[PDB]
Amino acid sequence: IGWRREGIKYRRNELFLDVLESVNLLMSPQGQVLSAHVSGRVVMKSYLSGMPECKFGMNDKISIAIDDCTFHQCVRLSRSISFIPPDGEFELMRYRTTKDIILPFRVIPLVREVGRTKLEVKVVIKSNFKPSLLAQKIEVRIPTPLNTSGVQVICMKGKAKYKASENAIVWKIKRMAGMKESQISAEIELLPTNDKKKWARPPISMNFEVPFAPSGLKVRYLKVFEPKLNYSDHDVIKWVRYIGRSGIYETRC
């Protein structure tokens, strides 16, 4: 036990759990999931007196399924997850998931060519989660062709700008509740070009942040036992927060 000293004490024994996940998605233009996984980690910040033996339980009777695991070299073999945490802040585990993942957003691209002069683009996004949860830091990136002379854009929500030097329309929305949908409409004006090879369209890209594990993971409990000191599990104050953030999250179109 060279990761936790002997005489630690706090009146007000408190712990904070961070469940951090990025969800990666590659999706066809028709909505077929081409590829998807979640990698996550649990960070624990604990202020607990003595030498507490903790037990971390989650909804993974496998109720979600974990493909892989790494633990802080403080957790013990079996069965459940057992340990005496370092004081303060540390990483409890890294994990990976691929099954029955929740895709917070569904991106629906629509692209009509109009003569050789113009591209009409409509993109719809749908919040796929409880209506009482709020997503934020939503960003949709629509690539535009090299020979783009300019862009018109309308959107009833958020704000959108063409950035030429980046060749993308960037759409920003502050927050969006689950079970909603939003449109963006763009008209892309084209310069004459080499009629040979077409536009090899990069996928439409997305960023967002949601207050839940897209893997579906829930902390069932964290239990503290310190056989010696007056305090017990019920004296401990416990908090959790879930942040699911987009990793690579693209929809071909």
Binding site: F16, D18, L20, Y221, L222, K238, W239, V240, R241, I243
Partner: peptide, 8 residues
């Protein structure tokens, strides 16, 4: 990243 909630 967000505001904490009671575990239970």
């Amino acid at each position: 990243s967000w505001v904490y909630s009671p575990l239970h």
